[PDB]
Structure 1
Amino acid sequence: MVNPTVFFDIAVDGEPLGRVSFELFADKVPKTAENFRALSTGEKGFGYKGSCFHRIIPGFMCQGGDFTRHNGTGGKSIYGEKFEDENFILKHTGPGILSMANAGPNTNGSQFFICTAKTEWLDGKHVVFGKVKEGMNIVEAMERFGSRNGKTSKKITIADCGQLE
């Protein structure tokens, strides 16, 4: 009836940077929304707290949520290792879009990316499920620690996370 809101408190080499919050589009993509919500609260016994943004590419996107292998090869959903693409109603319209990373059709786990540009060519293959609500300036700050090949110049971590309200 109202979409939930979750936050991440970001750190750079252990030092506090700021907080980003996200509206999750539970109205349109409820299953995909609930996965990210629950990984953010940690209520299933695992999740995003302490994990890193392993791949950041300025002018493209910030990617993380690989909490098992910390490098883009791991993660798992609250539903099993993988779950299906729920739908593609929502599109990659611009900076701040929150979207699922994947390795093929119906291979969603826990990895996600926040867009820092319009990424139209991802439409219909990555499930869009939320957007940055507060702290797009902190996402832009994060982005400056990326590189063309995605390697970060300092360690970008989710020091804390959970649900607002």
Structure 2
Amino acid sequence: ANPLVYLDVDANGKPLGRVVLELKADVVPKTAENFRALCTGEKGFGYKGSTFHRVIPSFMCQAGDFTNHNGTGGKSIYGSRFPDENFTLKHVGPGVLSMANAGPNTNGSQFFICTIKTDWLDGKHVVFGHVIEGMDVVKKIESFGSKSGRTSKKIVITDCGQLS
């Protein structure tokens, strides 16, 4: 039942590779389905053509603000925001896929892929998947970040979709 989706990512127009993510529809179906549909674009909008705007080495790579491209925007397939579904899944290490937010019950479209264990985010950010393949691509993304989050190159999700 768990979708496999993919992100194809470049830096300054140069492809970095493909990240494959499992979405834990068995634990957080509402959150998984939001991300799944934003990968396919089947609601008429989604991640394709948007950026990793905030990338912090030894922390995480954040993306999904396809409206403002700076961390202030994005929207879910349900509306602008939707509640925290649950906090069952934990930030157990590199490769965890989790919802960015602006506090309780503010999930939109922004998400992050961890590059370390970010356990202090447990109970505050909804984990909804993990990297199946392409953690080397995530590390390439991470290499273009900074401790401030600002990236040294424009990191673009050139394509995305569902594999199964």
Under a length normalisation based on structure 1, what TM-score does the superposition of the two structures give?
Answer: 0.98
Equivalent-residue separation in structure 2 for 1:102 and 1:88 (angstroms): 13
- Distance in 1 between residues matched to 2:65 and 2:155, nearest whole Å: 13
What displacement does 1:93 show? 0.1
Aligned to 1:101: 100
Counterpart amino acid of residue 148 in structure 1:
K
Supply the AA of the counterpart residue of 1:31: K
Q: Secondary structure at the match of 1:137?
A: helix
Aligned residues: 164
The equivalent of 1:144 in structure 2 is 143
C-alpha distance after superposition, 1:63-94 (max 9, x if no partner) = 01000000000000000000000000000000
- Aligned match of 1:45: 44
Verify: 1:118 aligned to 2:117, yes or no: yes
Distance in 2 (CA, whole Å) between partners of 1:144 and 1:11 is 13
**Structure 1 residues 28-78: Cα deviation after superposition (integer angstroms, max 9, x where no partner):** 000000000000000000000000000000000000100000000000000
Unaligned runs of 5+ in 2: none
Identify the residue that residue 82 of structure 2 maps to in structure 1. 83
Give structure 1 regions of 4+ aligned residues with deviation exceeding 2 angstroms. Answer: none
Percentage of matched positions with identical amino acids: 75
* Number of the residue aligned with 1:32: 31
**Structure 1 alignment gaps of length 5 or more:** none
**SS of residue matched to 2:5:** strand
